[PDB]
């Protein structure tokens, strides 16, 4: 909400200690878990399937997204942000997003989906979008040529 509270959360992730409400759909099986095109379709799968969405808050602290419901109070995606395959917002066409984890401790290429609670690309998009910032703040990511 412009300079005020948004300035706080933007810094929270920097120090690893943020959070935002959301309805984390669930998890699905995939043959990639390392891209963006898989997230766009993965989310769709979370629906067609029986992956009922939770009603809690995503514990984002620039280290590992730990989504937890507000009913059962149980961790769903207990994975590290540095180890996980990272997130990739669908297409910001309706405030939709989706994570991804290369097996690790989730069996196999497990695709994830979570639609922002407030729904306004101003709670999870910029929140988790920075969550990784702390991971590769110096853009350690090796995707381009670099120099």
């Amino acid at each position: 909400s412009k300079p005020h509270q948004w300035q706080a959360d933007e810094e929270a992730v920097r120090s690893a200690t943020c959070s935002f409400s959301v309805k984390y759909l669930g998890c699905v099986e995939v043959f990639e878990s390392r891209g963006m095109q898989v997230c766009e379709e993965a989310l769709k799968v979370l629906r067609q399937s029986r992956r009922r969405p939770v009603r809690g808050l995503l514990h984002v602290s620039g280290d590992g997204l730990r989504v937890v419901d507000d009913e059962t109070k149980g961790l769903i995606v207990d994975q590290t942000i540095e180890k996980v395959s990272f997130c990739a917002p669908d297409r910001n066409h309706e405030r939709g997003f989706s994570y991804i984890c290369r097996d690790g401790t989730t069996r196999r290429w497990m695709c994830h989906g979570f639609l922002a609670c407030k729904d306004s690309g101003e709670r999870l998009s910029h929140a988790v979008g920075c969550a990784f910032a702390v991971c590769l703040e110096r853009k350690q990511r090796r995707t381009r040529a670099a120099a």
Partner: peptide, 7 residues
Amino acid sequence: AYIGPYL
């Protein structure tokens, strides 16, 4: 986007 959908 930023880091995820790119880096």
